[PDB]
Design an enzyme around this catalytic site. Structure first.
Site, PDB file in Angstrom:
ATOM      1  N   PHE A  67      61.921  31.771   5.513  1.00  0.00           N
ATOM      2  CA  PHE A  67      62.393  31.482   6.870  1.00  0.00           C
ATOM      3  C   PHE A  67      62.177  29.719   6.671  1.00  0.00           C
ATOM      4  O   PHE A  67      60.970  29.435   6.318  1.00  0.00           O
ATOM      5  CB  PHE A  67      61.448  32.048   7.969  1.00  0.00           C
ATOM      6  CG  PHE A  67      62.187  31.802   9.272  1.00  0.00           C
ATOM      7  CD1 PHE A  67      63.557  32.601   9.563  1.00  0.00           C
ATOM      8  CD2 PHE A  67      61.802  30.898  10.178  1.00  0.00           C
ATOM      9  CE1 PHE A  67      63.963  32.344  10.915  1.00  0.00           C
ATOM     10  CE2 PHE A  67      62.332  30.954  11.440  1.00  0.00           C
ATOM     11  CZ  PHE A  67      63.568  31.568  11.775  1.00  0.00           C
ATOM     12  N   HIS A 122      61.048  25.150  11.489  1.00  0.00           N
ATOM     13  CA  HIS A 122      61.485  25.350  12.780  1.00  0.00           C
ATOM     14  C   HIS A 122      60.391  24.970  13.741  1.00  0.00           C
ATOM     15  O   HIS A 122      59.029  25.122  13.204  1.00  0.00           O
ATOM     16  CB  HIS A 122      61.819  26.683  13.033  1.00  0.00           C
ATOM     17  CG  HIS A 122      60.716  27.928  12.803  1.00  0.00           C
ATOM     18  ND1 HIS A 122      60.370  28.149  11.711  1.00  0.00           N
ATOM     19  CD2 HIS A 122      59.801  28.504  13.718  1.00  0.00           C
ATOM     20  CE1 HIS A 122      59.164  29.032  11.802  1.00  0.00           C
ATOM     21  NE2 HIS A 122      59.016  29.266  12.991  1.00  0.00           N
ATOM     22  N   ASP A 132      58.536  27.014  17.271  1.00  0.00           N
ATOM     23  CA  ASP A 132      58.818  28.311  18.064  1.00  0.00           C
ATOM     24  C   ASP A 132      59.330  28.068  19.487  1.00  0.00           C
ATOM     25  O   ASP A 132      58.995  27.069  20.129  1.00  0.00           O
ATOM     26  CB  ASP A 132      57.388  28.777  18.023  1.00  0.00           C
ATOM     27  CG  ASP A 132      56.822  29.318  16.886  1.00  0.00           C
ATOM     28  OD1 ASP A 132      57.660  29.448  16.015  1.00  0.00           O
ATOM     29  OD2 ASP A 132      55.552  29.757  16.845  1.00  0.00           O
ATOM     30  N   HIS A 135      57.072  24.159  11.174  1.00  0.00           N
ATOM     31  CA  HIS A 135      56.233  25.140  10.314  1.00  0.00           C
ATOM     32  C   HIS A 135      57.392  25.970   9.524  1.00  0.00           C
ATOM     33  O   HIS A 135      58.498  26.107  10.211  1.00  0.00           O
ATOM     34  CB  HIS A 135      55.220  26.061  10.710  1.00  0.00           C
ATOM     35  CG  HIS A 135      55.697  26.691  11.852  1.00  0.00           C
ATOM     36  ND1 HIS A 135      55.933  26.314  13.171  1.00  0.00           N
ATOM     37  CD2 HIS A 135      55.667  28.223  11.979  1.00  0.00           C
ATOM     38  CE1 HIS A 135      56.142  27.437  13.948  1.00  0.00           C
ATOM     39  NE2 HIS A 135      55.883  28.426  13.455  1.00  0.00           N
TER      40      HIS A 135
HETATM   41  C1  LIG Z   1      56.063  34.291  12.905  1.00  0.00           C
HETATM   42  C2  LIG Z   1      57.385  33.807  12.562  1.00  0.00           C
HETATM   43  C3  LIG Z   1      56.874  32.537  11.673  1.00  0.00           C
HETATM   44  S1  LIG Z   1      58.350  32.989  13.710  1.00  0.00           S
HETATM   45  C4  LIG Z   1      59.856  32.871  12.656  1.00  0.00           C
HETATM   46  C5  LIG Z   1      59.777  34.028  12.001  1.00  0.00           C
HETATM   47  C6  LIG Z   1      60.908  34.698  12.963  1.00  0.00           C
HETATM   48  O1  LIG Z   1      60.996  35.803  12.734  1.00  0.00           O
HETATM   49  C7  LIG Z   1      60.754  33.607  13.691  1.00  0.00           C
HETATM   50  N1  LIG Z   1      61.031  33.878  15.278  1.00  0.00           N
HETATM   51  C8  LIG Z   1      62.282  34.108  15.872  1.00  0.00           C
HETATM   52  O2  LIG Z   1      63.151  34.509  15.053  1.00  0.00           O
HETATM   53  C9  LIG Z   1      62.218  34.487  17.270  1.00  0.00           C
HETATM   54  C10 LIG Z   1      61.945  35.705  17.676  1.00  0.00           C
HETATM   55  C11 LIG Z   1      62.529  35.830  19.191  1.00  0.00           C
HETATM   56  C12 LIG Z   1      62.167  37.336  19.545  1.00  0.00           C
HETATM   57  N2  LIG Z   1      63.548  37.971  19.010  1.00  0.00           N
HETATM   58  C13 LIG Z   1      62.583  37.297  21.029  1.00  0.00           C
HETATM   59  O3  LIG Z   1      63.570  37.799  21.799  1.00  0.00           O
HETATM   60  O4  LIG Z   1      61.584  36.873  21.983  1.00  0.00           O
HETATM   61  C14 LIG Z   1      58.275  34.526  11.884  1.00  0.00           C
HETATM   62  C15 LIG Z   1      58.055  34.992  10.286  1.00  0.00           C
HETATM   63  O5  LIG Z   1      58.975  35.056   9.663  1.00  0.00           O
HETATM   64  O6  LIG Z   1      56.837  35.239   9.950  1.00  0.00           O
HETATM   65 FE   LIG Z   2      57.109  30.050  13.828  1.00  0.00          FE
END
Ligand SMILES: CC1(C)S[C@H]2[C@H](C(=O)[C@H]2NC(=O)CCC[C@H](N)C(=O)O)[C@H]1C(=O)O
Ligand SMILES: [Fe+3]
Length: 329
Positions: free
Chosen positions: A209, A212, A214, A268
Site C-alpha cells: 500500500f 498516504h 489517514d 506512511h
Molecule cells: C492500516 C492501513 C495502513 S490504513 C491503509 C491500509 C488500508 O486499507 C488503508 N485505508 C483505507 O483504505 C481507508 C479505509 C476506510 C474504510 N473503508 C471506511 O469506510 O472508513 C491499511 C493496511 O494496509 O494495513
Molecule cells: Fe494508514
C-alpha cells in the site's frame, strides 16, 4: 538498512481514571510523539487483542467465495449500490492479494435518522450468516464498543496535550452517531506471490500500500507481529516496529487540519511482506455534522487561517480521494 522509527510505548491507563496529574503526564507523552514521528503504541489499554486476532482469523479463514460475493461492496458487486463503505472487499487472485471486511457503527440501523435520510457515509452493516459464523457478529459489535472506549480515552489525552479540556474531541465522538469504522484486513501468504499485487516505491521498496495520510481524526490499529509499516520523517522512511500487544496510534488529516499541522498526519506506507497477517484498524471519525473550529497551539492567540470543515464533508471527500490516489482496496 532502513533506520527504526522512534515509536514510544505510552501507558494510557490513566486516561480511563480520575487522577488528573497522571493524565497530564500521559498527555505530554502524546504531545511529544505527535510532534516527533507521529506514532506511538498505546499499552495497558485493557483490550483482549489476542482474542480479537483469534476471532478475526476464524472469520477470514472460513468465509467462502459465495459469502464474499453476497457481502461485497458495490465496487465488486453492482447489485449492492448501498454498500459504499461496509462489507467485503475481495481479493483478485493473481492481481490483488489483500482482502477485507469493513463495518460501521452498530447503531446505524434501518430506523436511524441518518439511514432514513440516506445521508452519505452512513450505512447499515452487512453480516455473514450466523449459522456459518457463530458468534462473529456479536463479537465484532462488542469489539467496536471496546475500541470506541479506548479511542475515547485517547481523545481525552490528545485534548489535554493540545491545551484543551479533556472532552474537547470526545464530546463529538458519540455512540449514537460516530462515523468510525473497523476494517478487518487479511494480508495473505501466497506462493507464488503475484508481482501485479506488489507495488514499487520510488526508492525501490516493495509495497502492499503506497504512501498516504489517514482519513481520520486518529487511527487506532492492531496488527500481527510482522513488521511492515514505514513512516516518512525528515531522515527519510523509517521502519515502525511491530508490537502485537499494543495499539499503534497516529493522527489523521482531520487532526492536522484542526491543529494547523502542529500535529501532522504522518505519511506512511505498508511494505510488501509474504506472510499471513492481520491489519485491524479503527478509524476514529466524528459525527457527520461535527465541526471543531481550527486553532494553532504555536500561536499566542491560538488563531488559525484555516476554515471550519464539518467532519462529514471531510470524510466523504477523503475516502474518495484515497481510492483515487492509492486504488480500490
Ligand atoms: C492500516 C492501513 C495502513 S490504513 C491503509 C491500509 C488500508 O486499507 C488503508 N485505508 C483505507 O483504505 C481507508 C479505509 C476506510 C474504510 N473503508 C471506511 O469506510 O472508513 C491499511 C493496511 O494496509 O494495513
Ligand atoms: Fe494508514
Amino acid at each position: 538498512s532502513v533506520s527504526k522509527a522512534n515509536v514510544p510505548k505510552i501507558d494510557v491507563s490513566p486516561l480511563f481514571g480520575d487522577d488528573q496529574a497522571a493524565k497530564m503526564r500521559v498527555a505530554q507523552q502524546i504531545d511529544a510523539a505527535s510532534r516527533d514521528t507521529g506514532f506511538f503504541y498505546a499499552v495497558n489499554h485493557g483490550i483482549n487483542v489476542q482474542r480479537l486476532s483469534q476471532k478475526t482469523k476464524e472469520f477470514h479463514m472460513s468465509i467462502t467465495p459465495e459469502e464474499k460475493w453476497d457481502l461485497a461492496i458495490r465496487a465488486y458487486n453492482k447489485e449492492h449500490q448501498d454498500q459504499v463503505r461496509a462489507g467485503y472487499y475481495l481479493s483478485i487472485p493473481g492481481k490483488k492479494a489483500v482482502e477485507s471486511f469493513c463495518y460501521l457503527n452498530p447503531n446505524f440501523t434501518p430506523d436511524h435518522p441518518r439511514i432514513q435520510a440516506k445521508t452519505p457515509t452512513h450505512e447499515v452493516n452487512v453480516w455473514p450468516d450466523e449459522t456459518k459464523h457463530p458468534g462473529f457478529q456479536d463479537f465484532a459489535e462488542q469489539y467496536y464498543w471496546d475500541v470506541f472506549g479506548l479511542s475515547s480515552a485517547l481523545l481525552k489525552g490528545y485534548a489535554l496535550a493540545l491545551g484543551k479540556e479533556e472532552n474537547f474531541f470526545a464530546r463529538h465522538f458519540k455512540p449514537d452517531d460516530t462515523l468510525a469504522s473497523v476494517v478487518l484486513i487479511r494480508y495473505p501468504y501466497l506462493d507464488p506471490y503475484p508481482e501485479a499485487a506488489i507495488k514499487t516505491a520510488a526508492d525501490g521498496t516493495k509495497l502492499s500500500f503506497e504512501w498516504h495520510e489517514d482519513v481520520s481524526l486518529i487511527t487506532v490499529l492492531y496488527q500481527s507481529n510482522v513488521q511492515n509499516l514505514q513512516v516518512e520523517t525528515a531522515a527519510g522512511y523509517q521502519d515502525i516496529e511491530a508490537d502485537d500487544t499494543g495499539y499503534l496510534i497516529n493522527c489523521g488529516s482531520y487532526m492536522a487540519h484542526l491543529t494547523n499541522n502542529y500535529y501532522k498526519a504522518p505519511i506512511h506506507r505498508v511494505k510488501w511482506v509474504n506472510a499471513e497477517r492481520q491489519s485491524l484498524p479503527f478509524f476514529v471519525n466524528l459525527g457527520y455534522d461535527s465541526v471543531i473550529d481550527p486553532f494553532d497551539p504555536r500561536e499566542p492567540n491560538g488563531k488559525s487561517d484555516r476554515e471550519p470543515l464539518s467532519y462529514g464533508d471531510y470524510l466523504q471527500n477523503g475516502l474518495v480521494s484515497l481510492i483515487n490516489k492509492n486504488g480500490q482496496t
